[PDB]
């Protein structure tokens, strides 16, 4: 029964030694085969099916998903609905996990992570909206389904998205192309990256996770 468990835990341990870096994770070519083999194993591991996703995994995914170790053509990220919904869910887990662990400068680190989270979340959603509008034909089925799950409910934006949804290609592209300049991806990459590292720091300082923030800590005592 638990020979599979002892195995899976060791695979999870191994990934942890590849996914926890001081700065953000990026999958390097020399790691990719073993990183793949580990994920696949855990993916089909019977004993992992109802195990809680550790927060290092969710972080590493977010770093990898939003290419956080760069500083962004906007187009290294796959803006597919199915993926980005799950990306937001995993991001949501990190924030809840952060909030929960925090109860057990701390005001600043908590408050910044809050502000940064909402800012990043909003940006992800706005850029998801941007991609949805560039479709021909538009996937209203998933687009409106997305707006229930992620993105708030203001008659203003609700109807404005609907109004623009019934316009055409070149005008739809123009609203997006203007608003992508008015709201650049570089802004959110910064935010999301700072959130992740702000989060990392709290959890090592206070909750005693190990996110390799030991060197960052000692430079704040000086």
């Amino acid at each position: 029964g638990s020979n599979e468990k002892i195995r899976s835990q060791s695979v999870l341990n191994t990934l942890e030694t590849f996914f926890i870096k001081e700065n953000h994770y990026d999958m390097q070519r020399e790691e990719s085969s073993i990183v793949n083999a580990c994920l696949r194993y855990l993916g089909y591991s019977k004993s992992m099916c109802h195990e809680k996703m550790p927060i290092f995994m969710d972080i590493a995914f977010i770093e990898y998903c939003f290419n956080l170790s760069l500083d962004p053509d906007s187009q290294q990220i796959l803006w597919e609905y199915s993926l980005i919904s799950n990306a937001l869910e995993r991001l949501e887990n990190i924030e809840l996990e952060r909030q929960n662990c925090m109860r057990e400068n701390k005001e600043t680190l908590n408050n910044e992570a809050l502000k940064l989270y909402s800012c990043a979340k909003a940006g992800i959603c706005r850029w998801m909206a941007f991609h949805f509008l560039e479709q021909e034909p538009i996937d209203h089925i998933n687009f409106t389904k997305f707006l229930q799950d992620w993105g708030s409910h203001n008659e203003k934006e609700m109807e404005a998205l609907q109004r623009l949804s019934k316009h055409k290609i070149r005008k739809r592209l123009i609203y997006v192309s203007q608003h992508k300049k008015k709201m650049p991806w570089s802004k959110f990459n910064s935010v999301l990256s700072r959130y992740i590292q702000c989060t990392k720091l709290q959890l090592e300082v206070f909750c005693d996770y190990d996110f390799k923030q030991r060197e960052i800590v000692k430079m704040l005592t000086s």
Partner: peptide, 17 residues
């Protein structure tokens, strides 16, 4: 114990629409 660490003192984190 600063009031800024990861966020710059005057920074617009307000996303409209």
């Amino acid at each position: 114990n600063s009031d800024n660490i990861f966020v710059k003192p005057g920074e617009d984190l307000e996303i409209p629409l």
